[model samples]
Target: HMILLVSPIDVEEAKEAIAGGADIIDVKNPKEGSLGANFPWMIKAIREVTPKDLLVSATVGDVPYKPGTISLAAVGAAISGADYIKVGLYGVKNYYQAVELMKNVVRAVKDIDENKIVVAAGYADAYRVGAVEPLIVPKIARDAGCDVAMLDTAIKDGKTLFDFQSKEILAEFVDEAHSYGLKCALAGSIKKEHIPILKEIGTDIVGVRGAACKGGDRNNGRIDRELVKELKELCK
Candidate 1:
């Protein structure tokens, strides 16, 4: 079964997600961007509240090509008790830059805890931001010794992952990632209706913020436990 990753902005939201049966409590700041970095203290607080068996994922930021800063941020997330350290390749323009950035991020996270997972994320709408191509993300993660390859929209203008890439292409991305022994995660305004397509493609994880919130809103609305429960059951 595909794991459900729910992004909760604060402690209350994290509690609701836990009650809703979320597999991963993904901490992010929606106001910053798709994969915005939250405060390290927030990650540590959530880790304390969350059940030890459940995982916590922290988004470093929608980062740039500055490997040194990015690595430090990734390490901070790891030290803060995040089981997974995620970085959005918003500023990385090509394969070489992506590899260089993620390579350092992987090294940094592993130095803190070899058990920590490193995710190299790219935008599905890569052309708009001139970031790395979404399809090549799995290769980049693999080459950089990252544990997961992920794609999420950088822009939150109501567009979804499907709007940018068809289900067929997403399936190819998943297949490629698995072939490299890397897990694949897809997010970006994901809805309950998109769950089946994600399952069909054998997605390792399905991430969401909007769908699990009250009124299906990602930013303003709070996370509803009932809504997350429904989404988790659907993932089953």
Candidate 2:
């Protein structure tokens, strides 16, 4: 299993994650209400500090229906030195439109950097905003030229991924993602105890921020080295 450390806003946290054995360091701007918006400085900061072996993942945003907007965001992430560009497919009412939007972004970005990876993200619990179920996301992601499919809960205020459902459902999601030939990443309020279950479910990458932060605080923050160590041990 690979670990992707999310919410690394500065050089200190990025170095901590790399030192703690994180395979990928994700630079996120939580203030944007999206994972990776206006993060050129943050990405550059992390890139300057992290070694070349560590991959960098950056989110575009919780994109709406506009394909043009997402395309520009993808270009930004790619040019900013992101190895993987993640775009949230939440709030897209039409599956085909979402697929097309992602396709355009992938094509545009890959036109410049063919080695870049594109991640299609969908909200697991955001049904009202047209977010697809986790099991269905992989197919859509694949159709969109996405190299990865990630599950993120929409309402994220300390609720854990396990709290949202049964093990069977999560297992099904992993199975589908694999079947679609895409790597699967799980996020949305994941905790340390969830590591065992993640391994059992065949999760490829586990993303977290709050769980590793002191006092479990998302904002008043710094990733707790001890928690990161424990999670790495669990992954092993």
Candidate 3:
């Protein structure tokens, strides 16, 4: 089954997401970066409002290759009440680098709570930013002991995941991920029309921010219940 992961900036947006049926309430600051880290207070506040059944995901920022820095930040997210800790490989350039960063992240989070999920994110548009390619992330996650492998565009410059790779390419990516026994997730300007394609490609999770926000603008838009409801239905 696919999980509809919606990114909300704060507690109010989290309320709208949970009320509208979001499977996972994700915390991120779009003004910072694509996978910008939210504050400890923000995640704790969202956790207080969210039901116990719903999972909470928090980003560790579009980080550099500082293993120590990323590891500590990831631990903070976990301690702050994030069930899933996601780190975007924005500054990593190769597989070896990704492995090093994620290994620390996995250890940091799992050391605190063994059952917590550690998601290693690769960019679909990695080519532009020098991050590791999307297809190779699952292997990196597996080697690093992370729980999930995800892909999202590094830059919010209007280009989408489909623009960087085709359906066939993504299908192969999913196939490779499953071969390693790792769960997979996909996001990058995802819309309702892309749900069927994501389902066809066997996506385990589909993340969205702009699609669930008013007028489809993640940066300056508010999360609307009607939009969240509509996209949640599509994910189902």
Candidate 4:
């Protein structure tokens, strides 16, 4: 079972996630969005406290169409002791351009640390900005040299991924990611009730912030250990 743990802006909230049996801890800058902006202080703080067995991922923010910015963020995460680096693939409508941009970022980071894991993130419901559909994102991510393809729902304060859910739809996403021999991770307002279906669809990782937070509010800034345990058990 694979789970991607979230660290909100608050340090106490991050500690609760670790106590709740999170396999991997994601230290994100909380000012931007769920994945948050890039903050070196948050990344270093999480690394100092989290056990070595649990993996750590740091987001480089929702980057625009610049490959240089992506490369710099990847380097910062690697130096901060992040086991994985997640790059938000926003902008760049063309699939080939997306692949090329990510390939360059991954290559730059790999040069710094050959063992670093690179994740290509896309907005599953970000159609207003020409975001790619879930089924097609895996291929784009794979071609971009991403070890994992992650989905982050754009709009917040509303509906879970289930609102757009279909067994066939979900399977297409998983199958495509596996076809390219890459892992798939799902995020965006996921809840405890969503775990059973996520497992059924063979999702490699489920990213959560609201589900583990008090009142399921992203801005409330609290982590609910009980809910985290329940989700972890369900994943198992």
**TM-score for each prediction?**
0.99, 0.93, 0.98, 0.93
Residues 1-236 of candidate 3 have per-residue lDDT tens digits of 58899999988899999999999999998878899999999999999999999999999999999999999999999999999999999888889999999999998998999999999999999888787778889889889988898999988987888999899989998888888898989999988899999989999999999899887888888888788888888877
Candidate 4 residue lDDT tens string, 1-236: 65656655556766888888887788776567546555787788888888888888888877777888778878888888788888776665667767877898889889998888888888766674465555557887878778988887766756777776566787788878988998888887888777888888888988888888878787764787777787788888
Decide which is better by lDDT, 1 or 3: 1
TM-score, candidate number 4: 0.93
For candidate 4, the per-residue lDDT at 69 reads 77
- lDDT value for model 3: 0.91
What's the TM for model 2? 0.93
**Alpha-carbon RMSD, each predicted model:** 0.7, 1.7, 0.8, 1.6
Clashing pairs in 1: none
Candidate models: Cα lDDT each: 0.93, 0.79, 0.91, 0.77
Best candidate, lDDT-wise?
A: 1
Give the distance in Å from residue 43's predicted Cα in candidate 2 to where it truly belongs: 1.1
Q: What is the lDDT of candidate 2?
A: 0.79
Evaluate candidate 4 by giving its C-alpha RMSD to the native, one decimal. 1.6
Q: What is the Cα-based lDDT of residue 204 in candidate 3? A: 94
Q: Write one digit per residue (lDDT tens) for candidate 1, span 1-236.
A: 89999999999999999999999999998778778899999999999999999999999998989999999999889989899999999899889999999999999988888899999999999888888888899999999999999999988888999999999899999999999999999998999999999999999999999999897767678998999999999999
Off by over 4 Å in 3: none
Candidate 3 vs 4: which has more TM-score: 3
After the best TM-score superposition of candidate 2, give how far the Cα of residue 117 lies from its true spot, in angstroms. 0.9
Q: Which stretches of candidate 4 lie over 4 Å from their true place?
A: none
lDDT of 3 at 25: 96
Off by over 4 Å in 2: 34-36, 128-130
Q: Is candidate 2 or candidate 3 better by TM-score?
A: 3
